[PDB]
Every structure is written in structure tokens, then in C-alpha cells.
């Protein structure tokens, strides 16, 4: 039950993958609040390139909207809509 | 469609997720070689917990074997098996 080479290469080469991302990364302006959940799942470019002088970066972006709980200290728990950026295609470019 | 609260939460709570991991970071000792591909897909703990004093951590691990191409500078390209650690179960625990 060893994973064969071309399978390994194909599954690791630069493409959009489901990545759990802290909401504060996307909304650093709203650092005073607490969010539930604190992490959200987003298609983002990752994996490797043929060379260690190339980076995996996106070429087509898009937005998705999710319901997130937001708590301000000495204030209420609100559930509300927040928008996040997703990556649809990726390319290997020089670093 | 707007993703519903309960669905966001279920998808992002502490669990094993396919993750692209740099082979250098798993074997810093073998820093002399070049790897192709240079990262691999592994089941690892990710996601968030109900609280900000808990970490997502593994409770059950195992090994998977993959065919990797190992290149030494001024030497040949050899494809051989390497072993990596996977997480099978995850739980939220204190830090």
C-alpha cells in the first residue's frame, strides 16, 4: 500500500486546495471582536513547483459568503454574513 | 449560495485534513538532497476549537510510504520510498 510516484507528484503540484484560514488574517481591521468559528475553509493555492525559485500563486480569484458569529467585548453575540476570497486557478511564477 | 452557520462550523472544527507539507520541514537532517516533488499530501490535524485556550492535537497516528525522487548535486536521480507521519484522530485539548 505504497503511494506511487506519479500519483504523489499529481496530488502535490500547485493547485487550489481546501485550506483552513484564521478569519483575522482576512479581516485584520476587526481584531477587537471574537469569531465563532475562528477558522474558515477556503480554496487556496498550495503545493509545490518543479523548482525552488518558483512560487504557487493564483490567477483567477472569486468570493464566497458565510454566516459567522461575531462577539464584541461588553456587547452581544450576533450572527452575520462575511465575504472571503477563494482561488480558482493557480500558476507557478518566479520568486 | 450563502453557507449556513452550522455547516461552516462543522467543516472547520478540529479534524484530520489533507495538507501539503514541505519534505524539508519533515526531514531537516536530509538538507543536502533535493526532492521531487518537494512536498507531499498528508492527513494532519487542522481546524479550530470552541475556545482560544485549546489546541487541535492528534490522538492516533500512523505511517504512510511514498515514492519520492531524491537528487544529490553531481549524482543521479533515484526514486525510493520514504515514510511520513499521518494523523488519524484529532481532539481539542489545553495548551
Amino acid at each position: 500500500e505504497v503511494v506511487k510516484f506519479m500519483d504523489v507528484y499529481q496530488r502535490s503540484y500547485c493547485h487550489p486546495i481546501e485550506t483552513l484560514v484564521d478569519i483575522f488574517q482576512e479581516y485584520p481591521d476587526e481584531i477587537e471582536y471574537i469569531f465563532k468559528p475562528s477558522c474558515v475553509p477556503l480554496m487556496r493555492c498550495g503545493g509545490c513547483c518543479n523548482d525552488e525559485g518558483l512560487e504557487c500563486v493564483p490567477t483567477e480569484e472569486s468570493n464566497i459568503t458565510m454566516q459567522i458569529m461575531r462577539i464584541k467585548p461588553h456587547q452581544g453575540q450576533h450572527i452575520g454574513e462575511m465575504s472571503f476570497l477563494q482561488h480558482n486557478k493557480c500558476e507557478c511564477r518566479p520568486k | 449560495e450563502v453557507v449556513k452557520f452550522m455547516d461552516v462550523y462543522q467543516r472547520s472544527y478540529c479534524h484530520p485534513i489533507e495538507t501539503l507539507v514541505d519534505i524539508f520541514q519533515e526531514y531537516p537532517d536530509e538538507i543536502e538532497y533535493i526532492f521531487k516533488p518537494s512536498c507531499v499530501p498528508l492527513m494532519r490535524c487542522g481546524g479550530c476549537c470552541n475556545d482560544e485556550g485549546l489546541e487541535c492535537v492528534p490522538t492516533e497516528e500512523s505511517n504512510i510510504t511514498m515514492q519520492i525522487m531524491r537528487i544529490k548535486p553531481h549524482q543521479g536521480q533515484h526514486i525510493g520510498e520514504m515514510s511520513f507521519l499521518q494523523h488519524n484522530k484529532c481532539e481539542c485539548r489545553p495548551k
Binding site: 510516484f5 506519479m6 507528484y9 499529481q10 503540484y13 500547485c14 518543479n50 523548482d51 518558483l54 500558476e91 507557478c92 511564477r93 | 521531487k36 525522487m69 537528487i71 536521480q77
Partner: peptide, 15 residues
């Protein structure tokens, strides 16, 4: 075998 794109077995000949 262009370094910027994905794959053919006969790229991996050359190694």
C-alpha cells in the same frame, strides 16, 4: 520540458 508547467513521464527520461 518547460519548468513552469505540470508532468510527462518521458521529463522524468531526462532525470
Amino acid at each position: 520540458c518547460d519548468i513552469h508547467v505540470l508532468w510527462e513521464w518521458e521529463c522524468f527520461x531526462r532525470x
